[PDB]
From a paper:
A recent example is neutralization of the nuclear DNA cytosine deaminase APOBEC3B by the Epstein-Barr virus (EBV) ribonucleotide reductase subunit BORF2. Moreover, we recently discovered that the large subunit of the Epstein-Barr virus (EBV) RNR, BORF2, interacts with at least two cellular APOBEC3 enzymes, revealing an unexpected role for herpesvirus RNRs in blocking antiviral innate immunity. The seven-membered APOBEC3 family (A3A to A3D and A3F to A3H) of single-stranded DNA cytosine deaminases elicits broad antiviral activity, often resulting in lethal mutagenesis, with the archetypical example being HIV-1 hypermutation (counteracted by the HIV-1 Vif protein that targets restrictive A3s for polyubiquitination and degradation) [reviewed in (13–15)]. Here, we report a cryo-EM structure of the large RNR subunit of EBV, BORF2, in complex with the A3B catalytic domain.
Residue numbers in the entry:
A (entry chain C), C (entry chain A): 6 to 194, 207 to 227, 254 to 273, 284 to 613, 649 to 730
B (entry chain D), D (entry chain B): 193 to 240, 253 to 379
Write the structure that this text describes.
């Protein structure tokens, strides 16, 4: 076999120069797919023979062998497969390194069989629960047979309108491992059984006393300084009193308390946190005497040196939860500071699925059939407007951002996350909670393809529209799933949703693209039916699933050319390719706050600073303070420095 | 029952919910004087809806109406509703008032959307339903499983999952 | 440079196995394009610098350098360029061997620059004739600037909806060579000046007496037997009387005449051909006495041994011309027996352009802008129905065969042929003659993609619809061009068109997809305006463009697998891939007759026979007789034997 | 003129129609007694619309109204209409009745859609228009071209193209 040696040598010679050649990395991906062509399964029968130990008793594949073979063969010649293969060298490398499962015989699974496995797992779960199938049929009144369920999932996954989490893409139907990517716990120091897993862990170590893991601690801790400077990340659930006292009267003195007594500061928050904090300092129970200016500058310096500390506003995180949480307050987030659940009583997980918004453009080809925008079959989504009228710019490759296929993608992602929760939760409490994080990716790609800067007013309007619409769709789909499965998350009663609430009620100056009459109908149906999921929208950095799709990293602007360091002639025409550092950080924070009311969970908001103002250690402080003033939940995830 | 399948289909790990097959381990106890008495002949197990299979086998199990009996189900999945199993179990216990049913479900068959209603009507049928703890699992292993002397090896997370399922069931029944 | 050696070796290793692997020939084409990437021009400035001696005075390129660069760069990343590159190894080989021009410096022109050159030549011709521009603006009321003319031509050519002739794509603006692919002459034996050219030549040697060239001779010639058996092809303009006497009374004795006297048999045709022939035989002027059965069997045997003899019915060839031609009748065709013009008085040429009908499918992606199906601006083409309702079968990749973009393709092909005639005709008589041959390619691909056999009734209906619609569009566009250019072909007055005639009047049992009222309006506008072109539709085998576009060879079924020699299980599902030999030849002849009324010129009708009935030397005779009875012009072009 | 320019811009091959630039070669002949007489001083040529350029050059060419003059145009392209060249020529010959114009066009400028009308109106203006044959081309070569003794070298198809253009022109004028 002399072809494979030539293929590998050409792979090296093209990937060495693939950084500056956009035509060579695509060729590298094609040649890498060709090189592994004979080492992967070619037919569904061969796939079931090689992986018989994972599929000998999987009813769906065994009884739909022929239809699966027909659809996979159609997909192989489909333009979606060509797009997937032509996604670059990194996409193919990630496929053949992580996503594509390998059996005993060494015959890896092909890309077509990989997407077959994902869609078949989803379809089998839906047909097997008999309530997810009913919910899907009510939400898609064109699906009758289980093979049509597979068709729905297969078109929505192969077209990459739904970008599933890494554990889901890796172990859906091939392993009994947990499909929840994010795990957060707050033990009374259990945790060891999750460190041996392959999912991120967020630990609240505020009560300590005197895989990737994120440790969260409140600033009033006795060893806050020892925790700041030390594999393991850092988290700061900063109280509002910190930002207040730093903003005006910076000379005021912060107080530290050891967790031996600590009053009830960890348990509660809000205005009574100020009363309890000041009662404690008047009672002389403070162990520390550190000035608040010094602590703020220490946090800023530790952030600029390394992105270790995560800054999350306790008030925004807790007061906007669907429960009261005034009595007991969470103080720990997930690994990426974008999942917000209480975790003291039991281990809380979250299942994530992203939506590549470039696939929501009208001109973007999709494997989804054309006869699916109609026959949508949900009375609350037929009445919503589409084409997202926002006047795209002159240099716009995109032609409107349909905003209706965005809702279809949100529906399919909600159903996929429901399947993942039901068939891959590590504990029954997490399974019943049904925490869903629906992030986005390619938002910068959408703005560029529509000929705008990230900051342009059309970009902000489209951002708000996207997040409001996807939150509304997630709510409606979760309500339908809960109604047709009767699996309502345990705390739905005597909660905010049960009385009429949508997480955008508790914000100031929110403009809705929905006429407020369909929100009322959604509230009525939620009240009379319930919600299957407790959390819906959570913005994941999704650095892994974006590589195989080519979508831009999450909702951030481009940060991974030298558009700024380019002549003015080739600067206005490529101004929409400005890096995230080029954009004013105030505008990014304002856009994050604009999308915040429609993100029930947190969002991995990262600040992008250059080495001219980050070293000042006063611009970052002002950014954090004004992020406080806007009520953001995750004030700072990573302090990116260029 | 041979091993390597009792562990597989009686594990209560939610990550093992992928594969379904009902296995109803049954035994009959006679109320002699005031203490239930077990006999070796009526010990046995069934495979896959096993609930009905047992409902069809119980007429031909040398039943005596004069002496009231009690039967315990060491079933892998909780009895279901939309397939009707809870209905036939309630109907069987509605007319046959001299037989008491004990159900020990290793897992709650929540795959049926009507599982809560099934459990509620099973409770209303005079048969108490519970979730297997470690001692029921070891009793099943050393009674219905051809262990050939090998002791019972617990799986990871048996106690935690058993407690979670017991809490869910006791929340369902109290309604 | 080590990449080139690896590329060449892998090209060899992929093209050696490209016959049985459809994924390897595409990769071979991509890698051949990559290998020549640095050996071809990359920018429009570089293209104009390398080929300055052909474009120093070309005003269009010099004044539109920047816009051309922008459009070519957009085309490079456009999906049309990806489709062109992924057309296989043969397409790339033909590009880099024949079509791409090579300059003095050795830098070849790139594919994008090649299509730029074609579109720029067309746009420049339209701009500098000032009547073609007006006609195009009237026929496309969205084109204002010359750059929009270039956009129109570039979009239609890059998408390969319109395929130009080989001389056009080889010498459009780089050489002053003739752009007419077909040349036919009937000298009084001048011809030498065209043999030194690189175009097909068709010579009528009926008056002989006692590059590729096709010689045509009538059967009554005294040296007919010496002409039949002998680089040069053979042609037979067979009269009606031959088939009449062969069909009944085969024992009747045929007569041969020398051209020394010959009566007036060569000059005239029809019923008075029978009277002149019989008057001559009663006058005892016949040199020959050969039996007609022997002559017919000799022709059949010479055809089955080699496809040299071309059988064209003189009656259908002459009686359906737009003139009378009763007094003087043509006896020679072009090289491919598909161009029918008188050629005694002057050398007649024909400019050809093909249309890939697969590009007319609704699901086929096109480089043509979506905002072009509307704003047609031709009142006789906006009212015509589209989507060609024919109920495609279950296994249909295509979804309707729009039939409106077919008319747009016909319009653009008519304009391209007009430009070629105006700027590349070898003589003023041919330039005024304006003979246009608009063929089709990929018809078998259209039938297969619509889930039909070539013989299915939907296929026949679509065939008739396609040819009628394209003939109508060619007529309307030529009338518009003649009106806005004041260049009407010399014999339009006192001709058939000037009185109301459309070449489908003189046929029996013709069903019109046009409501016959729009035909009346076309007749009125032709009468009051005239026609720029004299001939409109002519079916070319187009064996060259089929390699570079992937469209099937002309209107023939697939003939260039072993579908017949395949198990019955994999025979019904692949039944639409039947070879042309599998289909009944009578059905093919019937479909050719069905499309004949809307083909004003002749077709390249080739019969496909196996080595079980061709050797019988009687089935071919019956096929020829049936083709005669249906009034076909070209009874047999090639007698293909498998 | 100069070689490689007269030959390039006076070739009547339809394949050379791509390159267009009007070149006008003029000479004036006075009608002395009964025979036209040519002089060297008014011999010359123009460049690129050469027709008007000559129409504005003629008043400053020592014109004598008393003696009737005749001027011959050995123009590369036939005079055009939509740019008004034919109209300007007609206007010049309408008032200046003592000047006769002879037009010898190497090619018919059919780029103008109204070239037939231009030729017809030029004929109506009293100036006869023809197409250059071989004799006219060689006269141009040895009169207006700096040949430096090199004889005239005809191109391929001169006679055929000249005859075709002459036939077209006489068909246009007869109307
Ligand atoms: Zn059951
Ligand atoms: Zn002029």
């Amino acid at each position: 076999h002399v072809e494979h040696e030539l293929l590998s040598k050409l792979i090296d010679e093209l990937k060495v120069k693939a950084n500056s050649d956009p035509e060579a990395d695509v060729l590298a991906g094609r040649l890498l797919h060709r090189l592994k062509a004979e080492s992967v399964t070619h037919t569904v029968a061969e796939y079931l023979e090689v992986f018989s130990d994972k599929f000998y008793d999987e009813e769906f594949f065994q009884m739909h062998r022929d239809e699966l073979e027909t659809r996979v063969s159609a997909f192989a010649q489909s333009p979606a497969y060509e797009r997937i293969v032509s996604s670059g060298y990194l996409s193919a490398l990630r496929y053949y390194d992580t996503y594509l499962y390998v059996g005993r015989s060494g015959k890896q699974e092909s890309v077509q069989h990989f997407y077959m496995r994902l869609a078949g797992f989803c379809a089998s779960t839906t047909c097997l629960y008999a309530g997810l199938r009913a919910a899907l049929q009510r939400a898609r009144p064109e699906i009758e047979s289980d093979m049509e369920v597979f068709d729905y999932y297969f078109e929505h996954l192969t077209s990459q309108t739904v970008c599933c989490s890494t554990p889901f893409m890796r172990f859906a139907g091939v392993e009994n491992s947990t499909l929840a990517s994010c795990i957060l716990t707050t033990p009374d120091l259990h945790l060891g059984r999750y460190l041996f897993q392959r999912a991120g862990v967020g630990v609240g170590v505020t009560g300590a006393g005197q895989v990737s893991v994120a440790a969260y601690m409140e600033p009033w801790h006795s060893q806050i300084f020892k925790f700041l400077e030390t594999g393991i990340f850092t988290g700061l659930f900063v109280p509002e009193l910190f930002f207040k006292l730093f903003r005006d009267t910076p000379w005021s003195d912060w107080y530290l308390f050891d967790p031996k007594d600590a009053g009830d500061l960890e348990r509660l928050y809000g205005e009574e946190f100020e009363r309890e904090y000041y009662r404690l300092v008047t009672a002389g129970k403070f162990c520390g005497r550190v000035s608040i200016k010094s602590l703020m500058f220490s946090i800023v310096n530790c952030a600029v040196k390394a992105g270790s500390p995560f800054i999350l506003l306790k008030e925004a995180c807790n007061a906007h939860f669907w429960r009261d949480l005034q009595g007991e307050a969470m103080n720990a987030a997930n690994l990426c500071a974008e999942v917000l659940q209480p975790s003291r009583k039991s281990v809380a997980t979250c299942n994530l699925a992203n939506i590549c918004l470039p696939r929501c453009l009208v001109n973007a080809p999709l494997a989804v059939r054309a006869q699916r925008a109609d026959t949508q079959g949900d009375e609350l989504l037929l009445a919503l407007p589409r084409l997202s009228v926002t006047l795209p710019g002159e240099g716009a490759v995109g032609d409107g951002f349909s905003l209706a296929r965005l809702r279809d993608a949100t529906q399919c992602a909600t159903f996929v996350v429901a399947c993942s929760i039901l068939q891959g939760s590590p504990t029954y409490d997490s399974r019943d909670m049904a925490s869903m994080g629906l992030g986005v990716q390619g938002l910068a790609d959408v703005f560029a393809d529509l000929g705008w800067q990230y900051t342009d007013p059309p970009s902000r309007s489209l951002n708000k529209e996207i997040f409001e619409h996807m939150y509304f769709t997630a709510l409606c789909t979760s309500s339908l799933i809960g109604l047709h499965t009767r699996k309502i998350f345990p705390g739905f009663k005597q909660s905010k949703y049960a009385g009429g609430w949508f997480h955008w009620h508790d914000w100031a100056g929110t403009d809705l693209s929905i006429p407020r009459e369909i929100w009322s109908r959604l509230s009525e149906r939620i009240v009379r039916d319930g919600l299957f999921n407790s959390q819906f929208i959570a913005l994941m950095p999704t650095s892994g699933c974006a590589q195989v799709t080519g979508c831009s990293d999450a909702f951030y602007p481009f940060y991974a050319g030298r558009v700024s360091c380019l002549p003015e002639a080739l600067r206005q025409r490529y101004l929409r390719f400005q890096t995230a550092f080029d954009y004013n950080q105030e505008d990014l924070i304002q856009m994050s706050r604009d999308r915040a009311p429609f993100v029930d969970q947190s969002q991995s908001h990262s600040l992008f600073l250059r080495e001219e103002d980050a070293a000042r250690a006063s611009t970052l402080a002002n950014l954090l303070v004004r992020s406080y003033e806007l009520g953001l939940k995750t004030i700072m995830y990573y302090c990116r420095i260029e | 029952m041979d091993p390597d399948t009792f562990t597989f289909n009686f594990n209560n790990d939610p990550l093992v919910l992928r594969r379904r097959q009902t296995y109803l381990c049954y035994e009959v106890e006679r109320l002699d004087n005031g203490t239930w008495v077990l006999m070796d002949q009526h010990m046995g197990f069934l495979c896959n809806h096993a609930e009905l299979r047992f409902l069809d086998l119980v007429p031909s199990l040398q039943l005596d109406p004069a002496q009231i009996y009690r039967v315990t189900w060491f079933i892998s999945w909780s009895p279901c509703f939309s397939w009707g199993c809870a209905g036939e179990v309630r109907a069987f216990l509605q007319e046959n008032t001299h037989v008491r049913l004990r159900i020990f479900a290793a897992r709650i068959y929540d795959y049926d959307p009507l599982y809560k209603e099934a459990l509620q009507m099973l409770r209303d049928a005079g048969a108490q339903v519970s979730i297997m703890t470690y001692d029921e699992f070891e009793y099943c292993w050393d009674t219905f499983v051809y262990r050939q002397g090998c002791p019972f090896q617990p799986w990871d997370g048996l106690e935690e999952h058993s407690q979670a399922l017991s809490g869910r069931l006791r929340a369902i029944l109290q309604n």
